[PDB]
């Protein structure tokens, strides 16, 4: 399966300028476009080599589009902040997702559009691509406007036709970049707190897709209460990483194994702590 | 590709 997401952050930055607007776009975890409203240019600067190929018309109309989106956010940062009656001159964000999944064969699967005001939820789209789950007494007003004017209809047309066809095009273009799985190299060691108790840590390094599960198999069961784990860490260079840890008495460490499962990993791996 | 049309305001 594959997806294509468009995150559209818009911080209201009042008084000291003009609403910032970063409009990242993603494909399956990797970024290929960007747009800061304060940078070198006012362009969809490319962010991945396989989109350089597109050519001047593409960048022109993509820039026109994303500046239209930026305009839309700077319009509705004065309506969300108007019904959530919210005190002119205070920072207050808007966030917007899009998407369209496909099958491994390239057939459309699901379409999702999700909006968020200050950190919480707002209107979102169903999985039948036909109605709107307002998540507040403001997203009520939004969904009424979107059920009227059939924004759902236009959006579904976009999603299936345009979003799916360009997604397949991108995966054609990036076929040497996106259709890859990075099997996490596994590494792990212990930090002795004292001569009676210690910690163990299990390292997931270099895996592209941001989905992976680390489990410490404590002698047949996962010691889920003693799982200190960190979030997914962007390794800066497109890959990812994460670790989880547990507190262990000395000697007992031989009763724990780290079990991990990733798309790049056919057989889930066992980490047996080398006593030395 | 970003949504082509000017979308409805939120």
């Amino acid at each position, epitope marked *: 399966s594959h997806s294509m997401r468009y995150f559209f952050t818009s911080v209201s930055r009042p008084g000291r300028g003009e609403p910032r607007f970063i409009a990242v776009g993603y494909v399956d975890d990797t970024q290929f476009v960007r747009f800061d409203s304060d940078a070198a240019s006012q362009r969809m600067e490319p962010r991945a080599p396989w989109i350089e190929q597109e050519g001047p018309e593409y960048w022109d109309q993509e820039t026109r589009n994303v500046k239209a989106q930026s305009q839309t956010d700077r319009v509705d940062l004065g309506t969300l902040r108007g019904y959530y009656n919210q005190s002119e001159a205070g920072s207050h964000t808007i966030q917007i997702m899009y998407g369209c999944d496909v099958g491994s064969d390239g057939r459309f699967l699901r379409g999702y559009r999700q909006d968020a005001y200050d950190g919480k939820d707002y209107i979102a789209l169903n999985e039948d691509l036909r109605s709107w789950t307002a998540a507040d007494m403001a997203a009520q007003i*939004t969904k009424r406007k979107w059920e009227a004017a059939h924004e759902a209809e236009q959006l579904r047309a976009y999603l299936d036709g345009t979003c799916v066809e360009w997604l397949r095009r991108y995966l054609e273009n990036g076929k040497e970049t996106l259709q890859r799985t990075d099997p996490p190299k596994t590494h792990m060691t212990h930090h002795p707190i004292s001569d009676h108790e210690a910690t163990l840590r299990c390292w997931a390094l270099g895996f592209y897709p941001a989905e992976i599960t680390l489990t410490w198999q404590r002698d047949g069961e996962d010691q889920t209460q003693d799982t200190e784990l960190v979030e997914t860490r962007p390794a800066g260079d497109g890959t990812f990483q994460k670790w989880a840890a547990v507190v262990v008495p000395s000697g007992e460490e031989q009763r724990y194994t780290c079990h991990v499962q990733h798309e790049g990993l056919p057989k889930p791996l066992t980490l047996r702590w080398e006593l030395s | 590709v970003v949504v082509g049309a000017v979308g409805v*305001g939120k």
Partner: antibody
Amino acid sequence: VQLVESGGGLVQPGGSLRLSCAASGFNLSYSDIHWVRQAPGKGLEWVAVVMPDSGHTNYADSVKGRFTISADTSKNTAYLQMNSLRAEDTAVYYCSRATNIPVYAFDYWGQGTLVTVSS
Amino acid sequence: DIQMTQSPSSLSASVGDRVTITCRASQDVNTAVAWYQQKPGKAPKLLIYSASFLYSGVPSRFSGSRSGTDFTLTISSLQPEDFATYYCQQSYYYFRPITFGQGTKVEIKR
């Protein structure tokens, strides 16, 4: 989200009074009536900037006292009041009764009136 | 401040006479202004809206164009049944129209 108008060709407000317009079609209820006003060859955005809902119904008022916040998204999206019978009582008040997207037709309006220069 | 200057043009639409109208500002836009016919003596009307995305009324024969830099912002008028005082209205920081232009003129040339 494309709509219609209302309001009437009001007659002499020589006693301070009120005026109203009213929507149709879809309910905007979030971004809606605007009451832009004009004189013969100008145009001004007085009280009742986004009024129905989304609050602060004077985004860019720059006038107060007699131009009055009156109504909201009851499907009849404002009823503005003058409180004036001699000074600046001559415009043709309007209603941007389609304001719904940054870029779709803003089916403004067709009417809004005055007293006269005379009284 | 914000000053919308109307850089007009006029006098000629007989049946097909192409006309270009431009407007100037004292602020800087991204890719847009608003446009607004005003038929003589009645009925204000949306027209072309912005730049980088025009959106047109049912008289969909005009072109409103981007300037990037605010040299001006421009419109193209062609036929003679569309004779109205056109206005240049404010975009980039979305003020729901706050500052109008001042007025141009277009007529059929008999």
